[PDB]
Design an enzyme around this catalytic site. Structure first.
Site, PDB file in Angstrom:
ATOM      1  N   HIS A  46       0.807  -1.212   0.000  1.00 35.36           N
ATOM      2  CA  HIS A  46       0.000   0.000   0.000  1.00 35.36           C
ATOM      3  C   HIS A  46       0.844   1.268   0.000  1.00 35.36           C
ATOM      4  O   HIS A  46       2.029   1.250   0.325  1.00 35.36           O
ATOM      5  CB  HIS A  46      -0.947   0.015   1.207  1.00 35.36           C
ATOM      6  CG  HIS A  46      -0.254   0.116   2.528  1.00 35.36           C
ATOM      7  ND1 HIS A  46       0.057  -0.987   3.295  1.00 35.36           N
ATOM      8  CD2 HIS A  46       0.173   1.192   3.231  1.00 35.36           C
ATOM      9  CE1 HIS A  46       0.653  -0.597   4.406  1.00 35.36           C
ATOM     10  NE2 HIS A  46       0.735   0.723   4.393  1.00 35.36           N
TER      11      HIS A  46
ATOM     12  N   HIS B 184       5.229   6.914  -0.597  1.00 38.45           N
ATOM     13  CA  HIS B 184       6.070   5.737  -0.767  1.00 38.45           C
ATOM     14  C   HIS B 184       5.292   4.445  -0.570  1.00 38.45           C
ATOM     15  O   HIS B 184       4.188   4.452  -0.021  1.00 38.45           O
ATOM     16  CB  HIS B 184       7.221   5.766   0.234  1.00 38.45           C
ATOM     17  CG  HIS B 184       6.775   5.621   1.653  1.00 38.45           C
ATOM     18  ND1 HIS B 184       6.407   6.699   2.431  1.00 38.45           N
ATOM     19  CD2 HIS B 184       6.613   4.525   2.433  1.00 38.45           C
ATOM     20  CE1 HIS B 184       6.050   6.274   3.628  1.00 38.45           C
ATOM     21  NE2 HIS B 184       6.167   4.958   3.657  1.00 38.45           N
TER      22      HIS B 184
ATOM     23  N   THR C 175       6.327   0.893   1.341  1.00 40.34           N
ATOM     24  CA  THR C 175       7.332   0.265   2.188  1.00 40.34           C
ATOM     25  C   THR C 175       7.561  -1.185   1.756  1.00 40.34           C
ATOM     26  O   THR C 175       6.609  -1.933   1.519  1.00 40.34           O
ATOM     27  CB  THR C 175       6.916   0.323   3.671  1.00 40.34           C
ATOM     28  OG1 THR C 175       6.792   1.693   4.075  1.00 40.34           O
ATOM     29  CG2 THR C 175       7.941  -0.374   4.559  1.00 40.34           C
TER      30      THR C 175
END
Ligand SMILES: Nc1ncnc2c1ncn2[C@@H]1O[C@H](CO)[C@@H](O)[C@H]1OP(=O)(O)O
Length: 204
Positions: free
Chosen positions: A64, A139, A141
């Protein structure tokens, strides 16, 4: 009231999650085996390092790109975020996120997301952010070192972009590898990667 999610964000499809995850793994394998990385291992930690194991804490399932951490309303600006029309309107809708780079630090591994103008409307407006365009923190991860929390990943990316704000040290199959000092590494993708995702809320 109704309690909000733990956080809002774009959740990648199975397909896109596989593709990005693998890309991340390959990057970690290549980078750790790379001559330029082996030279700077002293600025990375305190014989070769296996980076896939080093970033042992990884997302278990679908990936996600978070927008607003709400902690069920307890976080500041959480209510003010969820109430937005554009959030309520975009809830459950499909988006394509553009992946511009993969990065690695002593703390985190992740993927840089470059949000569209439309997607930035969903980015929260609540010193690390200073001087950079909105949504730079965006971003996905990929991994974290043992005692790190992946709120770190965003900070790590921002710090990196504050640096990029010179010349490639290496060439990888997917693009150019940059050594930004302090154990920080960036792969700029020759071809930006596109991942499909759905905007929704995670409760867990
Ligand atoms: N303080 C914070 N600010 C913004 N996002 C946070 C946060 N703390 C946790 N998160 C995000 O919410 C999740 C909590 O389980 C984390 O995976 C993290 O996602 P991230 O890896 O994309 O940054």
């Amino acid at each position: 009231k109704d309690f909000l999610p733990l956080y809002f964000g774009w959740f990648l499809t199975k397909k896109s999650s596989e593709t990005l995850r693998k890309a991340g793994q390959v990057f970690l394998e290549e980078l750790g085996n790379h001559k330029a990385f082996k030279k700077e291992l002293r600025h990375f930690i305190s014989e070769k390092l296996e980076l896939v194991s080093y970033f042992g804490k990884r997302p278990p399932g679908v990936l996600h790109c978070a927008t607003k951490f709400c902690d069920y309303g307890k976080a500041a600006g959480a209510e003010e975020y969820a109430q937005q029309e554009v959030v309520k309107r975009s809830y459950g809708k499909a988006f394509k996120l553009s992946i511009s780079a993969l990065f690695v630090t002593p703390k985190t591994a992740g993927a840089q997301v470059v949000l569209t103008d439309q997607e930035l409307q969903l980015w929260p407006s609540d010193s690390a952010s200073e001087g950079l365009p909105p949504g730079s923190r965006a971003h996905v991860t990929l991994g974290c070192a043992a005692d790190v929390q992946p709120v770190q990943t965003g900070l790590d990316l921002l710090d990196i972009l504050q640096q990029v704000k010179g010349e490639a040290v290496g060439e990888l199959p997917r693009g150019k590898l940059y050594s930004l000092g302090k154990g920080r590494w960036m792969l700029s993708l020759t071809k930006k990667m596109e991942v499909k995702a759905i905007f929704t809320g995670y409760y867990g």
